[PDB]
Write a protein that binds this ligand. Sequence first.
Ligand SMILES: CC(=O)Nc1c(F)cc(C(=O)N[C@H]2CC[C@H](O)CC2)cc1O[C@@H](C)c1ccccc1
Length: 127
Amino acid sequence: SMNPPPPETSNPNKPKRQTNQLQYLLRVVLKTLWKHQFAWPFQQPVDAVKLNLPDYYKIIKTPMDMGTIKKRLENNYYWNAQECIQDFNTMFTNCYIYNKPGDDIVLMAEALEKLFLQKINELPTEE
Ligand SMILES: CC(=O)Nc1c(F)cc(C(=O)N[C@H]2CC[C@H](O)CC2)cc1O[C@@H](C)c1ccccc1
């Protein structure tokens, strides 16, 4: 069994900025989800080897996780808030695509996604 390389968190070629919205996505959104009792399965890329999910990276071709998002935000990797919001939405969607309703991992994704939606609802206007 083999894991793919993780998503890119560094790329000098890539245009990037700090925006007040991306600052909010780190200080408020990432921080809120990261500290949650259900955060731990999402704090690093899915280890399909250790979890014995040999089909995971046959089904999930756009993997994403909060470990990757944390590194992208800390490295100021993003151009805009929408790129980062897409990463969160990819993470949740992947969980729902691979797993089935009522699975513990899905209940955990649903709890995190509720908070995500509550926080992004108050994403500030761009400065
Ligand atoms: C980020 C993510 O989603 N990870 C993750 C996953 F993709 C799949 C499974 C998993 O075992 N799915 C099975 C459900 C039942 C089906 O019949 C067969 C597949 C577990 C996962 O997380 C572990 C740490 C976990 C394990 C237990 C509780 C919470 C998290």
